[PDB]
Every structure is written in C-alpha cells, then in structure tokens.
Design an enzyme around this catalytic site. Structure first.
Site, PDB file in Angstrom:
ATOM      1  N   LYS A 111     -90.519 -56.643  -5.735  1.00  0.00           N
ATOM      2  CA  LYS A 111     -91.395 -55.491  -5.627  1.00  0.00           C
ATOM      3  C   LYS A 111     -92.739 -55.899  -5.017  1.00  0.00           C
ATOM      4  CE  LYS A 111     -89.185 -52.931  -9.375  1.00  0.00           C
ATOM      5  NZ  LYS A 111     -89.278 -52.464 -10.785  1.00  0.00           N
ATOM      6  N   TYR A 153     -84.614 -44.413  -6.933  1.00  0.00           N
ATOM      7  CA  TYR A 153     -84.936 -44.091  -8.318  1.00  0.00           C
ATOM      8  C   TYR A 153     -84.652 -42.624  -8.634  1.00  0.00           C
ATOM      9  CZ  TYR A 153     -87.230 -48.625  -8.936  1.00  0.00           C
ATOM     10  OH  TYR A 153     -87.494 -49.972  -9.040  1.00  0.00           O
ATOM     11  N   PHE A 177     -93.437 -41.371 -15.479  1.00  0.00           N
ATOM     12  CA  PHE A 177     -93.936 -42.469 -14.662  1.00  0.00           C
ATOM     13  C   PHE A 177     -93.299 -42.513 -13.280  1.00  0.00           C
ATOM     14  CE2 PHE A 177     -90.445 -44.001 -17.279  1.00  0.00           C
ATOM     15  CZ  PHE A 177     -89.622 -44.619 -16.358  1.00  0.00           C
ATOM     16  N   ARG A 228     -79.394 -59.565 -13.916  1.00  0.00           N
ATOM     17  CA  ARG A 228     -80.299 -58.897 -14.847  1.00  0.00           C
ATOM     18  C   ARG A 228     -80.813 -59.865 -15.907  1.00  0.00           C
ATOM     19  NH1 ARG A 228     -81.620 -53.264 -14.048  1.00  0.00           N
ATOM     20  NH2 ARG A 228     -81.562 -53.061 -16.332  1.00  0.00           N
ATOM     21  N   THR A 231     -86.560 -55.339 -18.874  1.00  0.00           N
ATOM     22  CA  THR A 231     -87.322 -54.432 -18.019  1.00  0.00           C
ATOM     23  C   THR A 231     -88.801 -54.455 -18.383  1.00  0.00           C
ATOM     24  OG1 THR A 231     -85.379 -53.018 -17.750  1.00  0.00           O
ATOM     25  CG2 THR A 231     -87.525 -52.061 -17.223  1.00  0.00           C
ATOM     26  N   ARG A 238     -89.350 -62.343 -15.202  1.00  0.00           N
ATOM     27  CA  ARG A 238     -90.403 -61.545 -15.821  1.00  0.00           C
ATOM     28  C   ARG A 238     -91.031 -62.263 -17.010  1.00  0.00           C
ATOM     29  NH1 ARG A 238     -86.411 -56.335 -15.340  1.00  0.00           N
ATOM     30  NH2 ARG A 238     -87.019 -55.680 -13.225  1.00  0.00           N
ATOM     31  N   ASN A 294     -93.306 -55.165 -12.958  1.00  0.00           N
ATOM     32  CA  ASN A 294     -92.319 -56.153 -13.379  1.00  0.00           C
ATOM     33  C   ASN A 294     -91.769 -56.979 -12.216  1.00  0.00           C
ATOM     34  OD1 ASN A 294     -90.827 -54.124 -12.209  1.00  0.00           O
ATOM     35  ND2 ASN A 294     -89.683 -53.592 -14.066  1.00  0.00           N
ATOM     36  N   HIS A 322     -86.617 -56.032  -9.141  1.00  0.00           N
ATOM     37  CA  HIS A 322     -85.619 -55.023  -9.468  1.00  0.00           C
ATOM     38  C   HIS A 322     -84.233 -55.634  -9.323  1.00  0.00           C
ATOM     39  CE1 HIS A 322     -82.935 -51.526  -9.164  1.00  0.00           C
ATOM     40  NE2 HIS A 322     -82.482 -52.103  -8.065  1.00  0.00           N
ATOM     41  N   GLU A 340     -76.898 -48.969  -4.062  1.00  0.00           N
ATOM     42  CA  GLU A 340     -78.190 -49.443  -3.580  1.00  0.00           C
ATOM     43  C   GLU A 340     -78.041 -50.318  -2.342  1.00  0.00           C
ATOM     44  OE1 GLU A 340     -79.711 -51.356  -7.039  1.00  0.00           O
ATOM     45  OE2 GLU A 340     -79.939 -49.487  -8.164  1.00  0.00           O
TER      46      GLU A 340
HETATM   47  O1  IDP Z   1     -92.410 -46.785 -19.201  1.00  0.00           O
HETATM   48  C1  IDP Z   1     -92.588 -47.130 -18.082  1.00  0.00           C
HETATM   49  N1  IDP Z   1     -93.894 -47.039 -17.505  1.00  0.00           N
HETATM   50  C2  IDP Z   1     -94.105 -47.458 -16.144  1.00  0.00           C
HETATM   51  N2  IDP Z   1     -92.986 -47.976 -15.360  1.00  0.00           N
HETATM   52  C3  IDP Z   1     -91.627 -48.071 -15.964  1.00  0.00           C
HETATM   53  C4  IDP Z   1     -91.420 -47.675 -17.252  1.00  0.00           C
HETATM   54  N3  IDP Z   1     -90.136 -47.864 -17.537  1.00  0.00           N
HETATM   55  C5  IDP Z   1     -89.536 -48.371 -16.442  1.00  0.00           C
HETATM   56  N4  IDP Z   1     -90.468 -48.498 -15.473  1.00  0.00           N
HETATM   57  C6  IDP Z   1     -90.345 -48.990 -14.123  1.00  0.00           C
HETATM   58  O2  IDP Z   1     -89.130 -48.237 -13.363  1.00  0.00           O
HETATM   59  C7  IDP Z   1     -88.312 -49.156 -12.927  1.00  0.00           C
HETATM   60  C8  IDP Z   1     -86.846 -48.682 -13.086  1.00  0.00           C
HETATM   61  O3  IDP Z   1     -86.661 -48.238 -14.399  1.00  0.00           O
HETATM   62  P1  IDP Z   1     -85.262 -48.654 -15.164  1.00  0.00           P
HETATM   63  O4  IDP Z   1     -85.124 -47.854 -16.436  1.00  0.00           O
HETATM   64  O5  IDP Z   1     -84.099 -48.371 -14.242  1.00  0.00           O
HETATM   65  O6  IDP Z   1     -85.323 -50.257 -15.536  1.00  0.00           O
HETATM   66  P2  IDP Z   1     -84.600 -51.451 -14.659  1.00  0.00           P
HETATM   67  O7  IDP Z   1     -85.466 -51.781 -13.467  1.00  0.00           O
HETATM   68  O8  IDP Z   1     -84.456 -52.676 -15.531  1.00  0.00           O
HETATM   69  O9  IDP Z   1     -83.238 -51.005 -14.183  1.00  0.00           O
HETATM   70  C9  IDP Z   1     -88.566 -50.365 -13.843  1.00  0.00           C
HETATM   71  O10 IDP Z   1     -88.259 -51.519 -13.201  1.00  0.00           O
HETATM   72  C10 IDP Z   1     -90.077 -50.270 -14.116  1.00  0.00           C
HETATM   73  O11 IDP Z   1     -90.821 -50.933 -13.003  1.00  0.00           O
END
Ligand code: IDP
Ligand code: IDP
Ligand code: IDP
Ligand code: IDP
Ligand code: IDP
Ligand code: IDP
Ligand code: MG
Ligand code: MG
Ligand code: MG
Ligand code: MG
Ligand code: MG
Ligand code: MG
Lengths: 153, 153, 153, 153, 153, 153
Positions: free
Chosen positions: E12, E52, E60, E88, E94, E105, E115, E118, E129
C-alpha cells in the site's frame, strides 16, 4: 487510544554487554514508534530499587538489583499509539523460555534473570517510570516526517 | 534445567542447497546457545535410517531417507538451558504451513517434506542423536566469554 | 580460472567467541561460493604452528599460536572461481585498521592480532592448508541447484 | 594508539527522521567499539555554532546550523583503538556521492548537506567535541565482556 | 494443496512511502514463493472501489479509498502451495495491534488504516483481484531453479 | 546535479532465480532514491538485442542475449540526484571479480556473464533504455515524504 502515549523501554546491562543496542532500537524504530528520550546511564542502587519497588519482597530482588547495577543501561522513552502494550509484545514474555521467536527475548535471551530488556507494563506505571528515570527537559518534542503514513488520524 | 543441556540440530539438504546455513546458525547463535560441535557430512544410508528409526513404518520413510541422502547435511550440537525445547520452538512446527513467521520454517519453508532443518524432540532422543552423528572427540569444550551475561549465577 | 578452485577459510577463536559464525558463513554463501567442508575443531598446538610455519621467526608468533589455541575454530573449505583471491577480498586487509567497511574485518574487527578470520593467500597454500586441516573424506562432493545461474560456463 | 581513545559520533536530524538510529549504532557496535555515552538532544543554537566554529565563514554555515536545529540529534561517544580515524572510515566520505557502498553514507545518504551523521576528524577535535556535548558525568566507565577478544594483550 | 496456487499481494502507499518494498518482497522470496507478476501502479479511484467493493457500506470506506490513492502501489502476484492462506499469515492480522512480531504488520505497522500491505483472503477473491489488477500477459511463466528443493512433489 | 535524474536498473534472470529481488531493491531504497517505475517482464529477443545493440559484434553477444531470455527480468526506473553514476557504484564493477564487498555484485555475484543486475552507464543511454523498456504511462509521479530530509534543495 492516543498516538502520544509513551512507554519506558530500557536495555538491561546484559543487552548492552552482548551488543544488542542497535537491534533493539531497530525493533521499535521499524515498527513506527517515535524515540523521544534516550540516554546511557549507570543509575544508583536507590533508583533501581525504587524502579522495582513492587518486587522488594521477592527472593530474587537483591540479585536483580545487583545485576541491574553491574553494567550500563540504555534508558529510552518511546511514543506511539498503544506503545505500552505493543512494546511489551515486541519484548516478548518476561521469561524468555515462554517467549516467541520474532520478539526481542524470543531472538536474544534465555534466562528470566537475563532478559536483556525492560518495558513498562501499564500506562500509569509508564508515567511513573518515565518521571523516575528522566527529567522533563530530556524528553524531546519533534514530529516524524512519516507521521501521516503511520497513523490514519 | 542445567545450562549444559545439549540438542542435535541438523540443516537438511534443502536448507544447504537454498543457502540457509548462515541464517540458521545465526538464529541459535544470537539466542545465546553455545555451538559445541559442527561438521558438514554426507552420512551413510544406515545412519539416516537409524536417525529416523521411529518412522520406519511410515509411508514416507523411504522417500525421507532418500531425500536426506540427496545432498550435504550440516550437523550441529548446541548447548544451553532448555536448548532441546527452545530449539524446537526456534525451528517452528514440523509442517511449515502450521509454523509461525519468525521461526526458521515460518521464514524459509513451505512443504513438510522440505522443512530445511531437524531438531531433537527430547533430551533422551538428543543424547541418542548426538551419539549417532558425532564421535565424543568432536564435541569441543569451551566457555563463552558472555556466559555470565546469558545466565544468572 | 576454474570454478572448482578451493580455499581454506577459518573463523578464529575471537570470531567464535563474539558470535560471528553465522554472519561470516553468510558472506561466502550469499556471494555464490560452495561450502564443501566444515568442522568445529580445537586443533593441537603442533598443527597451528605448522599452519603458520612461515611466521615462526616473527616476534608475534608465540602469541599468535597461543591465541589460536584459546578457543574453538570453525574450519571451512569453500569452492568457486577465484575463491582464493575473492575470499581474501571478502575478508579484508590483514590489519583491520586498513580494511574497508563491507568486508568481514571492515565490519567486525579492530586489532590485527584479533582479525576474526583466516583465508588462504594463494592457490598452492590453499591446497596445503586444506590437506593439513581436513581428511580427504571430509570434503563433500555435491552440485548446487543454482550452479548454472552463478556461472556462465 | 591506546584502546581508550574516544571520538564523538552524532546522528544528524535527517538520520533520526529517516529511522537510521538502530543501523548506525550497529555499525560501531558490531565493529567492536565501546559505547561510553549517548543521549538524544536538541541542543541550543550556540552549541551547534561552536561545534561548527571552524566553518563559521563558509557560505553554507547558517543553513547548516539551522538544519542541525530542525530535529533531534543522537549524540554518542565511542571508545576504542583508533576509533577517530576508523570512525571516519565507517561514516564514509563527507560528500555521499564520493562515499563507498558499505559505509554509512554510502548506504544511506546522497546529499552533502544531508549526510545523516557526523564524526570527529581528529583526536584533539574529538576531545573538544566530547567536552562541548557531554558533561563528564555522562561518560560511563565499564569493561566489555569481550574486550580480551577484541584486543590483543 | 496445489503448488500453482496464486494470490494478490499489494504494498500500500504507506509501505512504499516508508521504504518497505524490499523487506516485504524478501519475506515472500525467502519463504519460497514464486513472483509471477509485479508492477508499480497508481490505479484510478474506480479500480480501488472495485477492489474494496464489499466494504462500500463501511464508515471507513471513503478514507480507505482516498488513502489508497495517496501514493504508488506495488501490485504483485505470488505463486505457491497455500500461498493465499500462508500469505495472510506472513502479513499478520489486519489490525497491527493484534499482529505478532515476525509478521510484516507485526514488524512495521501500528494503525489498521495504515497496515502497509494487502493480501487476498481466499482463492476465489485472489482470482478476482488478479484479473482486476493485472492483464493476463503480465503474469510471467517460469520455473524456479530450487523448485524441487522447496517442494516434495 | 538535478534530483529528478532517472536511470534504468534491471534485475537479470540470475538475480531473480537466486532470490535477490528484495535485497537489490533495498540497496536503492535505503540509499534514498525514488522508485518511479517497476515491472516483472519477459521481453522478446528483439528488445534485448536493441538493449545491447552496441555489443552486437562482441563474441559474448549471443550468450548474453540467450541468458537474458532464460528467465524473468525485474525492470526498474530509479530517480535521484546523480542516480546514474551512483547507481553504477552501488551495483559494483561489471566484472564481479573487480567489484568491492558492499556493492551488489561484490556481495552476490562471481561471473561477469552472471552479474545479477544491469545499470545505465550514462544519462543519455538511461533515457534510451527507459523508453525502450517502459511506456510513458508506467512511470509514476509522486513525492517522497522524506524528500526534504534526503536533499538540501
Ligand atoms: O476499522 C477500520 N478503520 C480503518 N481502516 C480499516 C478498518 N478495518 C479494515 N480497514 C482497512 O481496509 C482494508 C480491507 O479491509 P478487510 O476487512 O478486507 O481486511 P484485510 O485487508 O485483512 O482483508 C484493511 O486492510 C484496512 O487497511
Ligand atoms: O524468577 C525470577 N528470577 C530472577 N529474575 C526475575 C524473576 N522474575 C522476574 N525477574 C526479573 O525482574 C524483572 C521484573 O519482573 P516483572 O515481574 O516486573 O516482569 P516484567 O519485567 O516483564 O515487567 C524481570 O524482567 C526479570 O529480569
Ligand atoms: O507427512 C509427511 N510427508 C513427507 N515428510 C514428512 C511427513 N511428516 C514428517 N515428515 C518429515 O520427517 C521428518 C521427521 O518427522 P517428525 O515427526 O519426527 O517431525 P520433527 O522433525 O519435528 O521431529 C520431518 O521433519 C519431515 O521432514
Ligand atoms: O603484527 C602483528 N601482530 C600480531 N598478530 C599479527 C601481526 N601480523 C599478522 N598477525 C596475525 O597472523 C596472522 C597471519 O599473518 P599473515 O602475514 O599470514 O596475514 P594473513 O592472515 O592475511 O594471511 C594474521 O592474520 C594475524 O592474525
Ligand atoms: O558544500 C556544502 N554544502 C552544504 N553542507 C556541507 C557542505 N560541505 C560540508 N557540509 C556539511 O557540514 C558538515 C561539516 O563539514 P566538514 O568539512 O567538517 O565535513 P565532516 O562532517 O566530514 O567533518 C558536513 O558534514 C556537511 O553536512
Ligand atoms: O566478457 C564478457 N563475457 C560474458 N559477458 C560479459 C562480458 N563483458 C560484459 N558482459 C555482460 O554484458 C553486459 C553488458 O556489457 P557492458 O560492457 O555494457 O557492461 P555494463 O553492464 O556494466 O554496462 C554486462 O553486464 C555483462 O553481463
Ligand atoms: Mg514489574
Ligand atoms: Mg522424530
Ligand atoms: Mg600467511
Ligand atoms: Mg569539521
Ligand atoms: Mg477484504
Ligand atoms: Mg553497456
């Protein structure tokens, strides 16, 4: 949780003697925490006994104080969101036998009496330890150039 | 748990072929364990069958012995407090898919048949494996200059 | 120059004591040279005096032999094109004060009497040192999986 | 050249901002030099002008002082044989464009006005800079557990 | 189970800005996975909202899409047995607060909104994807020289 | 002199095969140069003969082109002050026999026909190679968060 939370991290004399100052600092540096105070010190016995005052009844107390006096200590204050809890996770379990590889003690330590580093266990104890080890003017105020890339808000 | 416990650690032929001798040695070296014996060897088939004698009836036994004969092996004896159990922790789970990042297999391996390294699973099996792979004269007696900083007196 | 040239590299007792076995091996491993023999040994005084026979008239001879006896040595044979000359370049200048950062002595050593490592200075001296330190059966014959990616012919 | 020679090494604000405290400390730590003083500081303007007093008439003087005030500085005293000259070698050429890979500036820096670090250029200037940046009580007296393996008796 | 499984890994913009492209690629490279596609891209907002799409109702979502547009992205496709699930595990939780040291991370990130990386959460989503970010010609077909040492197949 | 100078750096198929993508990118990343374009490609033989058109009469031309076709190539464009000349210094001498430890070829390569990497030798040739390997849309425009700490401009 606020991004200006602070914790006290100290490299114990065994960490200094074994050449681990650089690697330990890199763990917190690479994670994104901000170094706001640091000094190599050889503190007096009274300060070390006050630092470990809650363990004064433990049978290992006098050996702990004598070993903390046996060499220099790298005292540090790190700042960041949840730096107290995450700092403890970076250090690993108090007894290195129970620590996981990838943590400081999981990579560098074996004995609980020689666990290389110290970290504040709570926010309130962090505030107390920082005031015990550092004068207010020893904490440096600055803003990291990558602050907005480490934190969302 | 005395500080003179010993375990047998071996870098399997895939770990040698993939250039992992240095990094694997550093994992144990940085943790504070003492290297007391080491040699690069291509041992006979009967030695590898005795090493894995407990798995002689497993369906992958012949494939395991043949693969362990397909390249050089870096055999090592490491000494330290709880070096058998902690050694297994450093290596990671037998199946790398279940291993955690930060361990040797969690950082470097994927397939259970190519888990790059071996470690004794118990003190009694360590003594067996040490006697199988090393003559007693190949274990070097020495005192680490930082022994008193790794272990509490 | 042939790709099967061999040189004798030894980690001196100060390198072993200071925890540099892993890093030094990684220098030759990452460069593309092949490890064909290795063993941790504590050789007798007679072998060390024969190894340094050309320096028997030097005033530092007896101190050199005593220091080479003071701890374990990691004896190694590395194979590769121009591994003798390039190995010496990797080790750096004999006196670490004249060594360049990026070499072993340029990264890890200060005193010429404690230069961490040894390397053969010529092909003919390499053949002599290999025969002095190793039995023929201790040299392992194998082919690296990336041989054709390190060498053009 | 005695083993107690001291030099002043400082990580400039750009080195702190770019997260290079750990790696720079490790360069001196791994080489075998002893850290005897360290502190993170934001010193007054008059201290930085005195530090660079020899360059007061250079056209880049005011820009150098202002940039050295723009962030925290990690000031250090390192002790070892020929630590002044070897320290300059580890740092690399003042202009990073002329520095060699393997040095601090050759690995991390590009612009001469942002060369991430400073090192004393002579023993007499080291004594001046140590007295300017550190109170005598901030230099910690201790004996490295591996001193006799870094230096010949 | 199949060694030709593929997943989509993206660095990212915060990972690019903080200079983590090298270390992140090394995590998958050292583990034994094969890079089959990579490109530095600045995709339009419509593509990121596609990527997304399942989070379009999250509070968010707008901040996430804007942050993903704020800098370059290193898009990658890695191939290997169970590379989706293991990928993962290498990235870590996450929320970096919940991640373990030794993961990407856990070593480099603090905030969930920053983070660094991805990874595809399933095989089907990985195929979706990969088709969204890469054209079929951009996936390179090749076989690693150490494939038979990484896999028992 | 200009900080927007660009050069073409390519990881050759031997560098990809030996798992050096991460370490090589880290060399330019840690130095302070900006990655503005990158892609993993398997270019046709006609493009590679264009890239090495000035060597069409060399006796090693046919072997060079065939070796450049034998695996994937990581094509990159790096931007920074004097990035062409400094990039060549980071790579090391064309013949790794002549390269110094601390450079890419000095740490990882042995044979000139397998020197792991390529770098533009001049600004004009860099502009030619960038147009040959990359489309103008593939060069990403962005500004590093630490630009003002890398450059004095
Ligand atoms: O609560 C939050 N606040 C701000 N950003 C979030 C939050 N939860 C997830 N994200 C961001 O959205 C991205 C995608 O969300 P997801 O639920 O698919 O987790 P993942 O990346 O592990 O698959 C996450 O990598 C993170 O950067
Ligand atoms: O059982 C023991 N024997 C010797 N030293 C101990 C023992 N338990 C704890 N210590 C030492 O005292 C220090 C402080 O103990 P504490 O209970 O506060 O754990 P903590 O350091 O993780 O906060 C430990 O880090 C360790 O060095
Ligand atoms: O199911 C399998 N298929 C192929 N090889 C296996 C399998 N299970 C174990 N092995 C291999 O045999 C070796 C010894 O098996 P063991 O059960 O003792 O695990 P261990 O190495 O952790 O002690 C393992 O390291 C692994 O290389
Ligand atoms: O002047 C000296 N004082 C103490 N030890 C020395 C001195 N000169 C050389 N040595 C030691 O003897 C070893 C062998 O010396 P030699 O002249 O063969 O250089 P070399 O090790 O690079 O081949 C050196 O590595 C060094 O450890
Ligand atoms: O020409 C210049 N333009 C901008 N800054 C310079 C220039 N020359 C030197 N400096 C800066 O002043 C510092 C001190 O200059 P000096 O000549 O003493 O080099 P030194 O740091 O190696 O001792 C240098 O480190 C550098 O940061
Ligand atoms: O003598 C040789 N034998 C085999 N390959 C060579 C030889 N000389 C150069 N090469 C290869 O051709 C490539 C381009 O040659 P060039 O003379 O332009 O060096 P350069 O890559 O440093 O610019 C080199 O990188 C090298 O891989
Ligand atoms: Mg406590
Ligand atoms: Mg078993
Ligand atoms: Mg000699
Ligand atoms: Mg000066
Ligand atoms: Mg998702
Ligand atoms: Mg050319």
């Amino acid at each position: 949780s606020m991004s200006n939370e602070q914790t006290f991290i100290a490299i114990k004399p065994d960490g200094v003697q074994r050449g681990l100052i650089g690697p330990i600092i890199s763990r917190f540096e690479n994670r994104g925490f901000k170094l706001v105070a640091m000094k190599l010190v050889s503190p007096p016995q009274s300060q070390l006994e006050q630092h470990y005052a809650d363990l004064s009844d433990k049978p290992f107390f006098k050996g702990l104080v004598s070993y903390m006096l046996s060499g220099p200590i790298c005292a540090m204050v790190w700042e960041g969101r949840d730096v107290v809890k995450t700092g403890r996770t970076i250090l690993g379990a108090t007894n290195p036998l129970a620590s996981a590889p990838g943590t400081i003690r999981g990579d560098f330590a074996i004995d609980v009496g020689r666990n290389v580093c110290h970290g504040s266990d709570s926010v309130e104890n962090a505030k107390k330890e920082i005031a015990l080890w550092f004068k207010p003017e020893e904490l440096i105020s600055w803003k990291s150039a990558t602050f907005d890339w480490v934190y969302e808000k």
